[PDB]
Write an enzyme that holds these catalytic residues in place. Structure first.
Site, PDB file in Angstrom:
ATOM      1  N   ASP A  99       0.564   3.640   2.311  1.00  0.00           N
ATOM      2  CA  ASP A  99       0.283   4.219   3.641  1.00  0.00           C
ATOM      3  C   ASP A  99      -0.939   5.135   3.507  1.00  0.00           C
ATOM      4  O   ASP A  99      -1.968   4.676   2.998  1.00  0.00           O
ATOM      5  CB  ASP A  99       1.550   4.865   4.202  1.00  0.00           C
ATOM      6  N   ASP A 127       0.853  -1.185   0.000  1.00  0.00           N
ATOM      7  CA  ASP A 127       0.000   0.000   0.000  1.00  0.00           C
ATOM      8  C   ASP A 127       0.891   1.238   0.000  1.00  0.00           C
ATOM      9  O   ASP A 127       2.100   1.148   0.210  1.00  0.00           O
ATOM     10  CB  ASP A 127      -0.931   0.014   1.225  1.00  0.00           C
TER      11      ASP A 127
HETATM   12  N1  LIG Z   1       1.008   1.407   5.873  1.00  0.00           N
HETATM   13  C1  LIG Z   1       1.487   0.497   6.756  1.00  0.00           C
HETATM   14  N2  LIG Z   1       1.899   0.927   7.984  1.00  0.00           N
HETATM   15  C2  LIG Z   1       2.371   0.023   8.857  1.00  0.00           C
HETATM   16  N3  LIG Z   1       2.528  -1.298   8.695  1.00  0.00           N
HETATM   17  C3  LIG Z   1       2.121  -1.686   7.481  1.00  0.00           C
HETATM   18  N4  LIG Z   1       2.121  -2.979   6.971  1.00  0.00           N
HETATM   19  C4  LIG Z   1       1.612  -2.880   5.698  1.00  0.00           C
HETATM   20  N5  LIG Z   1       1.293  -1.654   5.345  1.00  0.00           N
HETATM   21  C5  LIG Z   1       1.602  -0.883   6.479  1.00  0.00           C
END
Ligand SMILES: Nc1ncnc2[nH]cnc12
Ligand SMILES: Nc1ncnc2[nH]cnc12
Lengths: 283, 287, 291
Positions: A223, A221
């Site tokens: 974030d 992703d």
């Molecule tokens: N955006 C994110 N923040 C923290 N841990 C994660 N693991 C996967 N995506 C994450």
């Protein structure tokens, strides 16, 4: 000889093993097997059914259990969120740096309390991974025809996805919640590449244990600094993780073979001597 | 049907927001709330008030039982929590006597119980990773801002207004808090670094309160009071700020009661369930 | 009552200092547990002085496990009005070179899990809610005494506010500086070091916080002299910090630190502290938000 622990058809499974440690029980039983002739042990960080959150994982027990089984190396994976435009979901990062924002976790084997080993250990962490083992993860990606992107020698417009980024920095947050947009942008402005929850203190304790450790992070992703439709949540993480885990398996299994094809005598002795020289109570 | 819980911070240690109809002296699966919960009505809208630091202000920020306070309000059927917090300013246009309806934060707290879920025997079972990109209930934030308009308090929105519309005292329509652990105030070095990060105010109590409210499926919004020879003028200014926040809270409760929240509440509950990592692994037969 | 008495907390390289002839050796307890070691009482000139090693006799207590509350409270219980403290540290800036000292005036706190206040709502703490201002967190009078003591011992002093860069002559005592205090026990990554440097911090250490905070809670005048033993890890691989680097440089600099500390104790003894001590106590009472 070498033996590779992995914390997370071409793997010959022998059996499952329950161990105890001075610091408690590991997250789960350990799967023992072989990759070719190299002994390998696999440990799920979050236990059966993924019931253990990042802040509650017994990192000390997991790393010590692998040490007690004779592991010379630990290869680790984690999901993570990208903080930067060129690290996109489906990419991987062979990390070389981190910024620690965890707290409340047992992050060293040594201290003055009864539940810890006697002594004061101040480990250097300037470059906190085993560099030879990082380069084996990158070479394994090349051997499996996965693109490798080195921002030192290439640039955007040479970046072909999905790719393994040859370097990168992680901020490790404590969890269990994901970051706010305010936090995401602050981490980005600090120049960090990804955000995760489990790298620290795992990487630190591996060095305390005399083990060569390298991490390959799976970008799932962006974030939450991009558009609302791209803000992280569990379903988004899992959907991308499921698509990327087959590549990460190929990399990890190829890297175990590449580790077993080299001599590690001096590196192992260097690892152990680094621990000895970091004892403040002895020096 | 709605029921609004109110967590009163500094200046609200003994709030007199409505005539007490009853009191509930309760505990929770996560320990004791800060004080007795006081029940009443604003108009015909049911309301519950508890002082974050207890009466007498004996509980410091890092020792407040945020889990128990949120759980106790949820146990009484609250659908919303409105919270106050006294804060210091990090930027030139946030002046003592102003208010901020927060929409963002940076967390520098530690050592506090910040989640209901986990693998400990006394936690709720499961692993919950809640999204926090925009960590407040936006509908409820806009209620607080509208309540201030309805009580004749200036509202300043830096996204649409030039700094010439920043007339004090004013409610800032958006803003970020850095939540430090306390009990000490920041050094100058720390304050300047927080300012350089673009944070608007500093306080000690927002986190994990806002996070736990979302874990509990509640709509949460916070209104901050900017509080900073001068000490006597600061204190009188703070008293006037508390009177204004009292007006805002009472108007906000009435405004919440005037609308239907069925879908918002259902979405609050659905967000909790969709954040259960252990259940979503199972829905796909993962590993 | 205008009596002064100077506590000294000795960090790395000060596990057993000979600042004066022992008069009394005190094994004490506090409401917050046992201090790091026995406390050694004596006199420097006519000034009563108390010495305590921060990490205990055999340097067995890591930074995050030091009982700062007990150490500060034990010194207060023996009548100390002042605490002078030493710490080994890494430099984050080019003009702070190994062998220099820094009379700190600011910090950025990255510690966690340590008991950092005497006050709270639980039975194992003093009753109350204490919110201490910390904008300038040291005792400024006592800072300037450390700086004067270095002048009196013919040790170069470099004040960046009034002197040119060319007047930075090593080894020197820097007249101001900010510390980031990390929790330990590990040293920083290169990533963390560059972030701390980009925030403008001058040095990195592990033990300043909560010691400086608790001293002020206790109504004591506290000042710290940091000993630069390394360039942390933002420079070349041959200058990356490790325990041996820290100890080797410290052995070289401890001699001058001792001279500064003994001169500072005499200089404190030569002045009246009545109004400053009164103000220290009054700041505690006015920071009580339960009252
Ligand atoms: N955006 C994110 N923040 C923290 N841990 C994660 N693991 C996967 N995506 C994450
Ligand atoms: N670089 C460093 N970081 C933390 N503590 C230290 N003590 C001495 N050098 C240090």
């Amino acid at each position: 000889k070498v033996k590779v622990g992995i914390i997370g058809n071409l793997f010959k499974k022998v059996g499952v093993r329950q161990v105890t440690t001075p610091f408690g029980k590991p997250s789960d039983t350990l799967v023992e097997g072989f990759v070719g002739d190299v002994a390998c042990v696999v440990l799920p960080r979050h236990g059966k059914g993924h019931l253990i959150p990042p802040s509650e994982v017994n990192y000390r027990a997991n790393v010590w259990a692998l040490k007690d089984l004779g592991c010379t190396h630990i290869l680790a994976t984690t999901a993570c969120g990208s903080l930067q435009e060129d690290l996109v979901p489906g990419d991987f990062v062979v990390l070389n740096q981190f910024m620690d924002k965890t707290w409340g976790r047992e992050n060293t084997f040594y201290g003055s309390k009864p539940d810890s080993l006697k002594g004061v250990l101040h480990m250097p962490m300037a470059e906190p991974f085993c560099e030879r083992t990082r380069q084996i993860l990158i070479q394994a990606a090349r051997n499996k025809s996965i693109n490798v992107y080195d921002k030192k020698t290439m640039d955007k417009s040479a970046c072909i996805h999905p790719c393994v980024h040859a370097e990168g920095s992680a901020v490790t947050i404590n969890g269990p919640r994901f970051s706010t947009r305010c936090e995401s942008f602050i981490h980005k402005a600090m120049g960090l590449d990804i955000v995760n929850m489990t790298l620290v203190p795992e990487v630190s304790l591996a060095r305390e244990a005399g083990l060569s450790y390298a991490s390959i992070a799976i970008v799932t992703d962006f974030d939450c600094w991009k558009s609302e439709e791209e803000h992280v949540c569990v379903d988004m993480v899992l959907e991308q993780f499921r698509k990327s885990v087959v590549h990460v398996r190929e990399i990890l299994l190829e890297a175990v073979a590449l580790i077993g094809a080299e001599d590690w005598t001096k590196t192992i002795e260097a690892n152990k001597a680094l621990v000895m020289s970091s004892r403040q109570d002895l020096l």
